[PDB]
Amino acid sequence: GLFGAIAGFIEGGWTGMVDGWYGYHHQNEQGSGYAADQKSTQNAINGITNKVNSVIEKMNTQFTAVGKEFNKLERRMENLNKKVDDGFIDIWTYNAELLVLLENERTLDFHDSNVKNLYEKVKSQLKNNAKEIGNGCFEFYHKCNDECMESVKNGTYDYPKYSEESKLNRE
Amino acid sequence: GLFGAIAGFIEGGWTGMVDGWYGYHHQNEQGSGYAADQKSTQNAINGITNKVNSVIEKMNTQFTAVGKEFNKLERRMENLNKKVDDGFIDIWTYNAELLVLLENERTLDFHDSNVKNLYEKVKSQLKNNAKEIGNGCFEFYHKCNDECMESVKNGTYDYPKYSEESKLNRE
Amino acid sequence: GLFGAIAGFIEGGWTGMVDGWYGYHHQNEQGSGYAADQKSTQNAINGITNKVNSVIEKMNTQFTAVGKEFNKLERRMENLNKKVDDGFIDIWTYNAELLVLLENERTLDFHDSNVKNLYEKVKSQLKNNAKEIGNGCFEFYHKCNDECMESVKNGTYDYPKYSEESKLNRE
Amino acid sequence: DTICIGYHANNSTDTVDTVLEKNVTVTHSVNLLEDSHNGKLCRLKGIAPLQLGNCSVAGWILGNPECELLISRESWSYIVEKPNPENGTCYPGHFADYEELREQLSSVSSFERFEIFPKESSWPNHTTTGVSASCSHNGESSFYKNLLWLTGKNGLYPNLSKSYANNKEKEVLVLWGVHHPPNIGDQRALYHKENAYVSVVSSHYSRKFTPEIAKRPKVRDQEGRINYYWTLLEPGDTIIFEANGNLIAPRYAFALSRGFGSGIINSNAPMDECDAKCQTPQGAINSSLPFQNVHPVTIGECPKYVRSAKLRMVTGLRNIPS
Amino acid sequence: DTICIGYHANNSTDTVDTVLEKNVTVTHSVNLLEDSHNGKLCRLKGIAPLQLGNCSVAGWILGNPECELLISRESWSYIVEKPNPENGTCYPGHFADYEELREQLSSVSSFERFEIFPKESSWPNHTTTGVSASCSHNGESSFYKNLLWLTGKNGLYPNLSKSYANNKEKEVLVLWGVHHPPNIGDQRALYHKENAYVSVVSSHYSRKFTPEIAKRPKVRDQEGRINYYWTLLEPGDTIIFEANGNLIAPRYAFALSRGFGSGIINSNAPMDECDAKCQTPQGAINSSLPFQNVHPVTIGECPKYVRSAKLRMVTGLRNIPS
Amino acid sequence: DTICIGYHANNSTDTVDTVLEKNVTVTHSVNLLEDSHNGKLCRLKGIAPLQLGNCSVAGWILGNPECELLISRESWSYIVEKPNPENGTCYPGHFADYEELREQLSSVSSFERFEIFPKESSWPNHTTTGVSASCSHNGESSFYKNLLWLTGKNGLYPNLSKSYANNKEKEVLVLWGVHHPPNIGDQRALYHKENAYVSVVSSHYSRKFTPEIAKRPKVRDQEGRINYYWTLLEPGDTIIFEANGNLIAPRYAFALSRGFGSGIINSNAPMDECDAKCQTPQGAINSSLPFQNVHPVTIGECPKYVRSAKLRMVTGLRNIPS
Ligand SMILES: *[C@@H]1O[C@H](CO)[C@@H](O[C@@H]2O[C@H](CO)[C@@H](O[C@@H]3O[C@H](CO)[C@@H](O)[C@H](O[C@H]4O[C@H](CO)[C@@H](O)[C@H](O)[C@@H]4O)[C@@H]3O)[C@H](O)[C@H]2NC(C)=O)[C@H](O)[C@H]1NC(C)=O
Ligand SMILES: *[C@@H]1O[C@H](CO)[C@@H](O[C@@H]2O[C@H](CO)[C@@H](O[C@@H]3O[C@H](CO)[C@@H](O)[C@H](O[C@H]4O[C@H](CO)[C@@H](O)[C@H](O)[C@@H]4O)[C@@H]3O)[C@H](O)[C@H]2NC(C)=O)[C@H](O)[C@H]1NC(C)=O
Ligand SMILES: *[C@@H]1O[C@H](CO)[C@@H](O[C@@H]2O[C@H](CO)[C@@H](O[C@@H]3O[C@H](CO)[C@@H](O)[C@H](O[C@H]4O[C@H](CO)[C@@H](O)[C@H](O)[C@@H]4O)[C@@H]3O)[C@H](O)[C@H]2NC(C)=O)[C@H](O)[C@H]1NC(C)=O
Ligand SMILES: CC(=O)Nc1ccc2oc(-c3ccnc(C(=O)N4CCN([C@H](c5ccccc5)c5nnn(C)n5)CC4)c3)nc2c1
Ligand SMILES: CC(=O)Nc1ccc2oc(-c3ccnc(C(=O)N4CCN([C@H](c5ccccc5)c5nnn(C)n5)CC4)c3)nc2c1
Ligand SMILES: CC(=O)Nc1ccc2oc(-c3ccnc(C(=O)N4CCN([C@H](c5ccccc5)c5nnn(C)n5)CC4)c3)nc2c1
Ligand SMILES: *[C@@H]1O[C@H](CO)[C@@H](O[C@@H]2O[C@H](CO)[C@@H](O[C@@H]3O[C@H](CO)[C@@H](O)[C@H](O)[C@@H]3O)[C@H](O)[C@H]2NC(C)=O)[C@H](O)[C@H]1NC(C)=O
Ligand SMILES: *[C@@H]1O[C@H](CO)[C@@H](O[C@@H]2O[C@H](CO)[C@@H](O[C@@H]3O[C@H](CO)[C@@H](O)[C@H](O)[C@@H]3O)[C@H](O)[C@H]2NC(C)=O)[C@H](O)[C@H]1NC(C)=O
Ligand SMILES: *[C@@H]1O[C@H](CO)[C@@H](O[C@@H]2O[C@H](CO)[C@@H](O[C@@H]3O[C@H](CO)[C@@H](O)[C@H](O)[C@@H]3O)[C@H](O)[C@H]2NC(C)=O)[C@H](O)[C@H]1NC(C)=O
Ligand SMILES: *[C@@H]1O[C@H](CO)[C@@H](O[C@@H]2O[C@H](CO)[C@@H](O)[C@H](O)[C@H]2NC(C)=O)[C@H](O)[C@H]1NC(C)=O
Ligand SMILES: *[C@@H]1O[C@H](CO)[C@@H](O[C@@H]2O[C@H](CO)[C@@H](O)[C@H](O)[C@H]2NC(C)=O)[C@H](O)[C@H]1NC(C)=O
Ligand SMILES: *[C@@H]1O[C@H](CO)[C@@H](O[C@@H]2O[C@H](CO)[C@@H](O)[C@H](O)[C@H]2NC(C)=O)[C@H](O)[C@H]1NC(C)=O
Ligand SMILES: *[C@@H]1O[C@H](CO)[C@@H](O[C@@H]2O[C@H](CO)[C@@H](O)[C@H](O)[C@H]2NC(C)=O)[C@H](O)[C@H]1NC(C)=O
Ligand SMILES: *[C@@H]1O[C@H](CO)[C@@H](O[C@@H]2O[C@H](CO)[C@@H](O)[C@H](O)[C@H]2NC(C)=O)[C@H](O)[C@H]1NC(C)=O
Ligand SMILES: *[C@@H]1O[C@H](CO)[C@@H](O)[C@H](O)[C@H]1NC(C)=O
Ligand SMILES: *[C@@H]1O[C@H](CO)[C@@H](O)[C@H](O)[C@H]1NC(C)=O
Ligand SMILES: *[C@@H]1O[C@H](CO)[C@@H](O)[C@H](O)[C@H]1NC(C)=O
């Protein structure tokens, strides 16, 4: 991936998360669980919806276009008509296939960027109150109940509220 | 944004900076102020200038092309001429609109990358002589007059010249 | 560069590395040397090979297409044939040149991303057992023979095996 | 206590192609390529088409006796002709500018059929009962229902000179023929003259036909020919026929009403009580996708035809499960 | 003491479309789509065009009496014809290959007008004063200024056989006509013969015209017709006219000088003392933008026509102020 | 002890263009634009072409005496005609639908030459020895080898009426001519008649030619003309010639075998003992690149023609050494 998140420092995907694309996985004293981040996932849905919509909108409706007949003394004009039809078909085929290739790549890159940015958000929230174990997880240096977990999810984590505890546990 | 800077960890823009795209904002004992980084801004201007120039250059001058007349027994040839004209117009319309869409997206992504890279440059200069408060700002752990600020701007910051002071202030 | 690695915090290239694109440069008691990372380089080779292959595959073989003759009373049809030929040539020229431009940019961006991701991998391996000197190098806080260097290269570095030594040397 | 950041996975086998990698298994995708059709000829926005059956465009517009089923149809969304029709010009000859007439009829949405020169009020001095075994119907000799073979009456073929003014406020399609007998005996035996002429003139159309007598190969047990001719009459113009023999006079004419979206297609698909917004010779398309690989010939509001076998666009992620 | 990294913002209302988001307000942008024109017909690089006025291409090139203002023009950058001209073929008839002649004249930058068969030195045994009320001028009967209606002289129409060699080093456009009277009385009354002929032959052009006498509808108070014909004469070739009647002889000819960038357009825009590098039927375009939605018909060096209403490319940032 | 992460560099001068920067020096690149050719006409997949030499398509297909070297060739991959050939219609005249015949022959892979009307078995009452000095060979008068100039025999030109049935299971190309003498003395002197006729009829082809006698300019020391005509005969159809004079009878015919990939090109490049999959008028192309700027006219399996001077795609990195 371009941004090193998907198939990068985060090695695999979670089949257990079934309500979104990018999400979390918390495990505290009250238990564990998966939960999809709705803001980032919704932004991706809006952007990709607008992308596919733009692709369809730039393909205007093809109206009536039928073949033509030519008598035995109009072979040049028949071959010119065929050349026109075949040429336009070739160009539109090339356009469609190439567009789908390139924008497929850019879509996967877009998801990779969304995951990288989400990870950087959570990291920028936690700061040194947790250590960065591999695979894109954070090991907390303090207690974090469901209140604190949901505080991290919606981007409202309180750093000074645990600086004493984390500085003590870091020994 | 793809690189999480613009509309990312830096939330908004500065109307007070009127001399460039990407810039700084310093506040020391001598006062505060905005100032645009001229190297990064100039690089963006060069790249985007070359992009628009390339777009215009790939659109070669359309020379004389007028309609044609056909008598009452040339309806097939008239409709073929129309099919050619309409087809080429459709293809060029599609090309222009799609190109503008995609390269608009890539231009905004380009700016986002420039901001992210500038922030990473300043961070790589300051190291642990300043702490990373949110919104893309740095809180200095030492004294920084206009000499030091301008040393950070032009990318000539001296790390050991303040390591003692910063290590003392970090307590 | 979009990802700030090539022509970014890593300023230049190594002519001394002749076996790959992205690589290393180790200097320990046993000596120094260059060595290309084969996994990342091979991934880049596969991706770019598939890109050029896709470009060639979307350009289907041009089969026989010769000019046509027209008598003195067929100037409109002659000019229509010319309009068709010239139009298709113009469109294919535009497609080829524009495609090469844009995908050249995206290829250089792809390399920049590969270098940035490799650096982030090595950093995520070393953690605080080495300090981040500029230009994309790591200064080890402990001893690292060829065994340890090759452990860093193939992505199998052992962090706790040197935490005591590095914590002592960090004083 | 730990928190992790990760991404979705599933059992999806959806694959797409990318610029760096082919056959990438993804979590979610949307197909943009329509390949399905119902294999039937359907109505276009409720309006039914015109099936010609075993009749060609020439046979349909000239009034071939085996095409009487097609006379009642005066409005359609498009025209279906079998790939190679059976009943066309039953009496052999050359149809002048046949393809141009096809192209003209391709933009016709409806017409009004009316006998411009009623068969029993126009030629009191001529015979209007000529028939041929080459244009037979129910085993007996017959002739076109939109033409009138003027032959000899009481042993004379007087100089006829008729005309018609366009009292219809629309374009009027006029058709006629010119007879070319094989030998001189049948020529004099049919038109009582040795050097005849036909003359058709309008405000901007003007042509004069001379019969060419020669020995020609048998086509449907006939050595003589009938060259067919047609013209469009603008609203307000007057067409003048002057003849002394060898004129296959016009009987019925057509007042044309133009319309876009119609056309002539060759198809063997059967008609059915279906309605669609898109019709192809292979069948009707019911889709909102931007591309289709069913057929390049389209009628109505169709997707854009491409030669591709697969156009799948990824919406989800690279599926990396377990 | 603090230092921050941020980005520009302003009061810009410029919006562009992106692949992920429509209507994105940006700080700086450049419009690539020209939609403005001056609504006037201008000179192309200083050279003025040829306004035909109420005259068609046929009327201009045949020397219609109401088009004498157009004779002095022998060089132009392009040709403007009104959408439906008024003064064309004043004497009715068919202009053979009219559209091909239009296409030929579309690539002409200038020509030399000269009387190839001077009216008072060529036909001493024929009358050269034939005029018609259908081609009237100042209320009185008249005729084309580039043609010569040869009629009877002292009661005889001798056998004329003239020719011309191309002494001009360029292509020479030759025009002539063939008269078709309504009845035999006017035929014999005008040409003293019953079976006339016209014969025009060159090195590679060869055609023979026979008058067709028939009753035709009135067009501009005329029942007879005049079929118009033309040909291009290569440098060095000789054209031969042989006739004994019904020949509308050529009077003036044109030595053609080819040129690219010219053409024939239909426009109602007025001429003005303006100069431009790009001309459209809607008006002249003064722009350096790569696209335009003004009109697809262009002359000179123009932007590429597109059907788009807006093509704005972002140069600045996403405008996120206050 | 230190470890570094860096990237490759070399002495490469390869430059490519990017959207943000022109003339970027890169480490590795691949050129996608073929500009080289061998400047020779080569075989297409082993099969050699048909070089016409100084002969045109008309001269080759009519049997011009200076083109006897081309009779032995009955199979080719494509056809090469010199830009302006020398030996075409040696006896002047108009070749009807010449360009359409060229287009027909462009899709022919081989044919069988056979004398349809053997010169000494078909016209026992006519002379088959007519020759002209305008079609000379070895300094002496001669005539086409695929046509037969029927002249007077023992002072009479009887009514001839021959025919041919298609016993070849393929399309049969038939050619013939119609003679137009300059004056009446040579007309009666050659065909013993004053009002002759030619009549060619098939199942769907039918035309009648009348000789036009007039004074025409000299072309190759000839005032008379010969209008050339041709037709395609479907498998199973019968063609009928009826004439009493002025018929340039057919001698040899051609049974056509269709084939794709062939065509007619104008080139001055010499033939050589080379084989290629792609042939252009400039020369043969031996490449696997997707683009070429050599020539737009292609035969075989060629790259797609573009007007570009450089299409280099970067594979390596931005070369930043020392
Ligand atoms: C002509 O084309 C139209 C347009 O495609 C087509 O109508 C479509 O049919 C499909 C399938 O019948 C519809 O898709 C369904 O939509 C409904 C409402 O949105 C959903 O409830 C369905 O979702 C799931 O539901 C089931 C469980 O409840 C699942 O088991 C099932 O697999 C579905 O995944 C389902 O997606 C679609 O809405 C219509 N579209 C329109 C505009 O009506 C039509 O069938 C075609 N043929 C004809 C003859 O018209
Ligand atoms: C035909 O097209 C040409 C090309 O566009 C056009 O000429 C252009 O006119 C504009 C507007 O008059 C010019 O733009 C100006 O450029 C000058 C010099 O660069 C600047 O000083 C101006 O900048 C600002 O100045 C003011 C304050 O001093 C501002 O209040 C004002 O709003 C401006 O923003 C201004 O941008 C442009 O330079 C020319 N281009 C050329 C090549 O001359 C011409 O008007 C069109 N019409 C005709 C009949 O020729
Ligand atoms: C027609 O086109 C074909 C296709 O391009 C062309 O054949 C090609 O010729 C080139 C050059 O002769 C071949 O490239 C070589 O490939 C071999 C085997 O892969 C390599 O060993 C060579 O590599 C290097 O070797 C040298 C040192 O040992 C270097 O000094 C040298 O510079 C090379 O860099 C070399 O790259 C290519 O393999 C063939 N292609 C095929 C399919 O055979 C042919 O010449 C053209 N002309 C004709 C008349 O056929
Ligand atoms: C004619 C035609 O087909 N037109 C058309 C136009 C625009 C479209 O846009 C899309 C489209 C966009 C973006 N995404 C998905 C998509 O595939 N989704 C599946 C996954 N789904 C996830 C999702 C992720 C993981 C498991 C389950 C759902 C989600 N997350 N949250 N919600 C509410 N849903 C989002 C939508 C689909 N399809 C489109 C189709
Ligand atoms: C026919 C035609 O229009 N051709 C054409 C060709 C190439 C172009 O390239 C550009 C183009 C490039 C890059 N940028 C800007 C642009 O919009 N700018 C406005 C902002 N401006 C900033 C800027 C940023 C914020 C406030 C004020 C200025 C700046 N920074 N420094 N300077 C000296 N200027 C840079 C240029 C504009 N316009 C182009 C137009
Ligand atoms: C008709 C035609 O030309 N078709 C075609 C199709 C697909 C292609 O894909 C490529 C292609 C891809 C990716 N890379 C390189 C390339 O330029 N390389 C040169 C550098 N080389 C480096 C390399 C890097 C630095 C020094 C030396 C080699 C390397 N690393 N490891 N190996 C084994 N090789 C990789 C390949 C080249 N060329 C292609 C050409
Ligand atoms: C991938 O896994 C999904 C499940 O997450 C599979 O979708 C499910 O497929 C089963 C059949 O294999 C469907 O079962 C049906 O359920 C309905 C309603 O309960 C019942 O009435 C039927 O009799 C049948 O049992 C199930 O509905 C379906 N799930 C959904 C949400 O539609 C999917 O098939 C798997 N893919 C593959 C390739 O196996
Ligand atoms: C967005 O803000 C800018 C200012 O940063 C506005 O541009 C300015 O608009 C005012 C009028 O609204 C211009 O005032 C004029 O100034 C000249 C010279 O001082 C004076 O002679 C005139 O009489 C008039 O007062 C001002 O020049 C202009 N600034 C520039 C640099 O051109 C802009 O209008 C704002 N946008 C919107 C949509 O309001
Ligand atoms: C850039 O540097 C490379 C070297 O890394 C240059 O390639 C080398 O060029 C030399 C000649 O300048 C070649 O020398 C030849 O070597 C063969 C085999 O040893 C020998 O038989 C010949 O007589 C000749 O001396 C050398 O082979 C070649 N290297 C390779 C791998 O092909 C390259 O020329 C430099 N670029 C420029 C523009 O100077
Ligand atoms: C309409 O078409 C049918 C065939 O589809 C014609 O029937 C043929 O008539 C010819 C007469 O020469 C016979 O030789 C064939 O054997 C018949 N074939 C069949 C299958 O019946 C019919 O004659 C046509 N009628 C008209 C008026 O064109
Ligand atoms: C694009 O967004 C702008 C604002 O971001 C829209 O401008 C406003 O449109 C609403 C209509 O919904 C008006 O009531 C406001 O007065 C507009 N604002 C101003 C400052 O005029 C604009 O309409 C949007 N464009 C589209 C196509 O929706
Ligand atoms: C040139 O055009 C004008 C009209 O633009 C012609 O004037 C008309 O002449 C006809 C003669 O039959 C009258 O019926 C009309 O009433 C006239 N209309 C007007 C507006 O004057 C004029 O005759 C034309 N002259 C030539 C030589 O073609
Ligand atoms: C692209 O850049 C290269 C160098 O980076 C240019 O090569 C030099 O061009 C100058 C001309 O301005 C010459 O004086 C030098 O001798 C060239 N260098 C070498 C090694 O030959 C090259 O000209 C540039 N291309 C373009 C189109 O400007
Ligand atoms: C074949 O072409 C050659 C020229 O390529 C002809 O030779 C010319 O014949 C004419 C006869 O009128 C002479 O005036 C020329 O001087 C000759 N030129 C040369 C170079 O010889 C030859 O006559 C042609 N033969 C046929 C049968 O067409
Ligand atoms: C039309 O042709 C079909 C052959 O498929 C035949 O069954 C049918 O009877 C024919 N109908 C008429 C009216 O000729
Ligand atoms: C041309 O037509 C206009 C009508 O707009 C009229 O005013 C003018 O007098 C006419 N001029 C000539 C020469 O016919
Ligand atoms: C063909 O023309 C060339 C002129 O390049 C001449 O040398 C050669 O003798 C000619 N051959 C024939 C058969 O006319």
Domain residue extents for chain C = 1-171
Residues E183, E186, E190, E192, CA torsion sign: positive
Check whether residue D105 and residue D227 sit in a common domain: yes
Q: Structure tokens of F224?
A: 């008379």
CB neighbours of F250 closer than 8 A, spacing ≥ 6? F116, F117, F146, F147, F148, F174, F175, F176, F241
Cα F226-E172-E41 angle, rounded to 5 deg: 135
Asked if C59 lies within 8 A of F317 by C-beta distance, the reply is no
Residue type, B107: T
Burial (0-12, 13-18, 19+ Cβ within 10 Å), E139: exposed
Contact D101, D72 (CB under 8 A): no
The candidate with the shortest Cα–Cα distance to D104, out of D234, D297, D263, is D263
Q: How far, in Å, are E69, E90, E139 from residue E55 at the CA level?
A: 10, 11, 18
Strand partners, E225: E180
Ligand 11 touching residue E15 (CB < 6 A): yes
The one-letter amino acid code at E279 reads Q
CB-based contacts of F292: which residues, under 8 Å, 6+ apart?
F33, F34, F35, F285, F302, F303, F304, F305, F306
Chains that touch E (3 or more CB pairs under 8 A): A, B, C, D, F
C28: Cβ–Cβ under 8 A, 6 or more apart, which residues? C143, C144, C145, C146, C148, C149, F1
Domain range enclosing D100: 42-272
b/e sequence E188-214, b meaning 16+ C-beta within 10 Å: eebbbbeebbbbbbbbebbeebebbbb
Please tell me if the CB atom of residue E2 comes closer than 6 angstroms to any atom of ligand 11: no
Neighbour-count burial for D183-212, b at 16+ CB within 10 Å, e otherwise:
eeeebeebbbbeebbbbbbbbebbeebebb
Query: After what residues is chain D interrupted, C–N > 2.5 A?
Result: none
Shared domain check, E63 and E34: no
Calculated CA dihedral for residues B61, B66, B67, B71, nearest 10 degrees: -140
The H-or-E segment that residue B113 falls in is helix B75-126
In whole angstroms, give the CA distance from residue A82 to residue A88: 10
By alpha-carbon position, which residue is closest to atom 5 of ligand 17?
F54
Q: Based on the domain organization, do F301 and F240 belong to the same domain?
A: no
Nearest CA in chain F to B58: F308
Residue B112, amino acid:
D
Asked if residue E59 has its Cβ within 6 Å of ligand 16, the reply is no
Number of H helices, E strands in chain D: 3, 28
> Hey, which residues does D51 pair with through a beta bridge?
D80
Cβ distance C9 to C136 under 8 Å?
yes
Do the Cβ atoms of E216 and D201 come within 8 Å? yes
The tokens describing F296, both together, are 């737009």
Structure tokens, D74: 């005066």
CA atoms of F87 and F259, how far apart (whole Å): 27
Ligand located closest to E54 CA: 16
**Residues D149, D214 share a domain:** yes
CATH number for the domain including E26?
2.10.77.10
Burial of F224 (0-12, 13-18, 19+ CB in 10 A): buried
Query: Is B47 at the interface with chain F, CB within 8 A?
Result: yes
H or E segment to which residue A122 belongs: helix A75-126
Cα–Cα distance, C112 to C120 (Å, whole number): 12
Phi, psi of D288 (to 5 degrees): -120, 15
Residue found by looking up tokens 């109307």 in the block: B15
Residue F231's φ and ψ, nearest 5 degrees, are: -160, 155
Determine the distance separating the centroid of ligand 6 and the alpha carbon of C22, expressed in angstroms.
14
In this structure, the answer to whether residues F67 and F210 fall within a common structural domain is yes
Q: How many residues does chain B have?
A: 171
Residues C138-163 as b or e (16 or more Cβ within 10 Å = b): bebbbebeeebbebbbeeebeeeebe
| Beta partners for residue F33, in sequence order | F291
Tell me the residue type at D209: F
F24 within 8 A of F15, measured Cβ to Cβ? yes
Q: How far is CA B157 from CA B24, B160, F59, in A?
A: 15, 9, 87
The CA R_g of chain D, rounded to the nearest whole Å, is 29
User: Is there a single domain that holds both residue F108 and residue F236?
Assistant: yes
Instruction: Please give the structure tokens belonging to residue F126.
Output: 């006519």
For residues A23 and A122, give the distance between their C-alpha atoms in angstroms, rounded to a whole number: 11
- For residue B115, which residues of chain E lie inside 8 Å, CB to CB? 5, 7
> In sequence order, what are the residues at sequence separation of 6 or more whose Cβ sits closer than 8 angstroms to the Cβ of residue D239?
D163, D164, D174, D200, D201, D202, D205, D231, D233
**What is the SS3 assignment for F206?**
strand
Query: Using CA atoms, how far apart are residues E65 and E147, in angstroms rounded to an integer?
Result: 11
Distance between CA A57 and CA A60 in Å, rounded?
Answer: 6
Residues 6+ apart with CB under 8 A from D202: D231, D233, D237, D238, D239, D240, E217
List the one residue out of D154, D153, D133, D116 whose CA is nearest residue D249: D116
CA dist., res. C99 & res. C55, Å (int): 9
The amino acid occupying position E2 is T
Same domain, yes or no: D291 and D241: no
- Side-chain half-sphere exposure of C118, counting CA atoms within 13 A: 32
- In the sheet that E299-300 helps form, which strands lie side by side, from edge to edge? E283-285, E278-280, E299-300
Q: How many domains does chain F have?
A: 2
Contact E182, E216 (CB under 8 A): yes
Return the amino acid letter for E178.
Answer: V
Question: Among residues D209, B106, D311, B136, which one has the least CA distance to residue A120?
Answer: B136
Q: Which of C153, F64, D4 is CA-nearest to residue A123?
A: D4
E268 plus E161 within the same structural domain: yes
Is there a single domain that holds both residue E118 and residue E143? yes
Of D251, D253, D252, D248, which is closest to residue D149 (Cα–Cα)?
A: D248
Give me the phi and psi of F172, to 5 degrees please: -120, 115
Contact between residue D146 and residue D67 where contact means Cβ atoms under 8 Å apart: no
Using the 8-state DSSP alphabet, how is residue D318 labeled? Answer: B
Please name every residue paired with E208 in a beta bridge, in sequence order, or none if there are none.
Answer: E199
Give the nearest chain F residue to B56 (CA atoms): F19
What is the bridge-based pairing of β-strands E41-44 and E271-276?
parallel
Interface of C with B (CB under 8 A): 1-4, 8-9, 76-77, 79-80, 83-84, 87, 90-91, 94, 97-98, 101, 134
The CA distance from E44 to A56, in Å, is 41
List pocket residues of ligand 6, CB cut-off 6 Å.
C 18, 20-21, 41, 45, 48-49, 52-53, 56; F 8, 28, 30, 288-289, 315-316
> Which method was it determined by?
X-ray
Burial bucket for residue E313 (CB in 10 Å: 0-12, 13-18, 19+): buried
The angle at the Cα of F193, spanning F189 to F198, to the nearest 5 degrees, equals 115
Q: Given CB atoms, is E20 within the 8 Å cutoff of chain D? A: no
Please indicate, yes or no, whether residues E162 and E253 belong to a single structural domain of this protein. Answer: yes
B100 conformational bin, left if phi > 0, alpha if psi -120 to 50, beta if neither? alpha
Q: Does the beta carbon of E159 lie inside 6 Å of ligand 5?
A: no
Q: C83 is written with which tokens? A: 């309009």
Is the CB of residue E214 less than 8 Å away from at least one CB of chain D? yes
Distance from CA of B117 to the nearest CA of C (A): 6
Task: Determine which residue's CA is closest to atom 6 belonging to ligand 17.
Answer: F54
On whether both D173 and D252 belong to a single domain, the answer is yes
Domain B1-171 class in CATH: alpha beta
Token reading at F39 = 């400047």
Pair (E25, E111) in one structural domain:
no
Rounded CA-CA distance D38/D267 in Å is 13
Structure tokens belonging to residue F119 = 């010169």
**Residues of chain D contacting E214 with CB distance shorter than 8 Å:** 199, 201, 208, 242
Whether residue E49 contacts residue E309, with contact meaning beta carbons closer than 8 Å, is answered with no
